[PDB]
Design a protein around this ligand. Structure first.
Ligand SMILES: C[C@H](CN1CCOCC1)Oc1ccc2c(c1)Cc1cccc(-c3cc(=O)cc(N4CCOCC4)o3)c1S2
Length: 557
């Protein structure tokens, strides 16, 4: 009941803990970021605050122990904040969560992020746009309406908002994602209905972003008109989808309405435009859609498969979905993209396919089409087995089961990567139509409708493996199966080392209207944390991951 600062003031700047207390502190400081500290642990961290200033990891624990309402305590806390060994860029993300409200703490977080490369920011931007919900809305407003018409209707100590707009003005890729991430937050009907002040803050972000662009030099002013061109392109694509959906008849009559409307550029302006960034991948500039190859994909939703002509004379296939919230897929593909990058940083390239996903609204968006990919179901239906498929398309005399050594190496690696990633992310509703293969050996998952332990069945296997994948490698007695097990436990150990970053990213998503998070927001981070088995040592994690694989594979046969 007596304030921590009253039970220990600045007089004991010289406290050093004994051997036992150091071991207790090292355990508290190593906790996952959203594990609740007991009052006793918070007292212990407060007590040895001056000692803990030498541990950058300890600062996030320390700031959660402060009574920010007690002026003298906040004063002492902010003095220590200044003295603290500066935390890592990755680790600052935690201070932009809902659990920190102190403006000096939130400004210190942004000052740490400022040290990051644009490559890193892009990897965290989906979550930094969520983090705006925890900023000071009044300060956002003081920086200075249909959100989709802001960018198209030009008039004739940083906080998070100021920082994101400043970095976006210098980097066209960052600008592109910032634009589309904020548009989707503005179009969110639940935010509009349940949280009008939050909707208003996101409108204010977009109006500030527009004004910063209109104030910039020639290059920066052109960025605005390129965002405007993408916005009006997507608006036309949506108009076109509504027309094709409003057509009575069958896939063939619908496909002719699609090709006809794409074919009329004076009407729709979709087949022949000045180079615009592809919203899905803005590094790729597009000349327009090829009308005569456009068709509806064979599914219930009937997304348009569209081929974009690129500035370098390539074709970039996408799906455009209308009447579908892509945000859950967008988050999972962004996290797989991050996991893939962390594995490559540690020199493990597991030949993953983090294909691009962008919501252009809560109701429509793009997915990258991986050209030459086929569902495993189709590989089975046509060639009987994965090994038959690989023998037909990548044969090798002196190679495993007569298959190219490079293709089998790619297959083993990608099977391992996806078995560990789909296990960590608790991906459900796995079957041979949402498992895809390429002729280069790449296996990958699509359609992330069930995540974080959800499944159509109540007790799904924790490891998402099937008989056909293992027979693909040449069964349980092959060198390839051994190499698969080794790559699984290696990948698991590497991702555990980034558990602080991955759990902080999910922490920043608990207020996003992503269905499988919205179900149980307060339980979301813990469901990811448990999969890392952070109660186990590295050696025990290896044995645990081998049990999971052995038990899953034993049951399959
Ligand atoms: C059997 C065909 C043969 N091809 C067709 C195209 O011309 C060349 C011959 O091949 C496929 C390949 C993949 C898929 C389908 C069919 C069905 C399908 C139908 C509707 C939607 C999806 C779907 C949903 C999704 O969420 C993410 C993704 N992909 C992302 C990764 O790249 C592949 C597509 O696809 C998919 S998945």
């Amino acid at each position: 009941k007596l304030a921590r600062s009253l039970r220990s003031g600045p007089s004991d700047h010289d406290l050093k803990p004994n051997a036992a207390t150091r071991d207790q502190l090292n355990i508290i400081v190593s906790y996952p970021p959203t594990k609740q500290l007991t009052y006793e642990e918070q007292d212990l961290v407060w007590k040895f605050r001056y000692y803990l200033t030498n541990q950058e990891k300890a600062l996030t624990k320390f700031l959660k122990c402060v009574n920010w309402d007690l002026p003298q305590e906040a004063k002492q806390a902010l003095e220590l904040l200044g003295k603290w060994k500066p935390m890592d860029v990755e680790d600052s993300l935690e201070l932009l969560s809902s659990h920190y409200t102190n403006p000096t703490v939130r400004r210190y977080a942004v000052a740490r992020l400022r040290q990051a490369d644009d490559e890193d920011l892009l990897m965290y931007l989906l979550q930094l746009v969520q983090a705006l919900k925890y900023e000071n809305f009044d300060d956002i407003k003081n920086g200075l309406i249909d959100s989709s018409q802001i960018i198209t209707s030009p008039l004739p100590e940083q906080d998070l908002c100021t920082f994101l707009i400043s970095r976006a003005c210098k980097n066209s890729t960052l600008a592109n994602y910032l634009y589309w991430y904020v548009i989707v937050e503005c179009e969110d009907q639940d935010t509009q209905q349940r949280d009008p002040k939050t909707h208003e803050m996101y409108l204010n972000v977009m109006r500030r972003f527009s004004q910063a662009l209109l104030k910039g030099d020639k290059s920066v002013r052109v960025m605005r008109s390129l965002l405007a061109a993408q916005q009006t392109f997507v608006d036309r694509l949506v108009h076109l989808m509504k027309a094709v959906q409003r057509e009575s008849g069958n896939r063939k009559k619908k496909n002719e309405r699609l090709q006809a409307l794409l074919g009329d550029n004076e009407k729709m302006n979709l087949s022949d435009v000045e180079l615009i960034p592809l919203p899905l991948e803005p590094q790729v500039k597009i000349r327009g859609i090829i009308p005569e190859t456009a068709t509806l994909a064979k599914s219930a939703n009937m997304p348009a498969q569209l081929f974009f002509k690129t500035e370098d004379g390539g074709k970039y296939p996408v799906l455009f979905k209308h009447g579908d919230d892509l945000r859950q897929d967008q988050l999972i593909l962004q996290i797989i993209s991050l996991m893939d990058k962390l594995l490559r940083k540690e020199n493990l390239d597991l030949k993953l396919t983090p294909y691009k996903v962008l919501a252009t609204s809560t109701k429509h968006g793009f997915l990258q089409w991986i050209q030459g990919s086929v569902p495993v179901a189709e590989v089975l239906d046509t060639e009987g087995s994965i090994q038959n498929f690989f023998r037909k398309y990548a044969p090798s005399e002196n190679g495993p089961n007569g298959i190219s050594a490079e293709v089998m190496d790619t297959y083993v690696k990608s099977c391992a990567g996806y078995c560990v990633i789909t296990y960590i992310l608790g991906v459900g509703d796995r079957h041979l139509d949402n498992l895809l293969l390429t002729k280069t050996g790449k296996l990958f998952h699509i359609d992330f409708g069930y995540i974080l332990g959800r499944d159509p069945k109540p007790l799904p296997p924790p490891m998402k493996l099937n008989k056909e994948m293992v027979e693909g490698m040449g069964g349980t007695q092959s060198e390839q199966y051994q190499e698969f097990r080794k790559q699984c436990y290696t990948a698991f150990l590497h991702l555990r080392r980034y558990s602080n970053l991955i759990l902080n990213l999910f922490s920043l998503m608990v207020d996003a209207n992503i269905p499988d998070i919205a179900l149980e927001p307060d339980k979301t981070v813990k469901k990811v944390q448990d999969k890392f088995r952070l109660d186990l040592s590295d050696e025990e994690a290896v044995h645990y991951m081998q049990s999971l694989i052995d038990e899953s594979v034993h049951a399959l046969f």
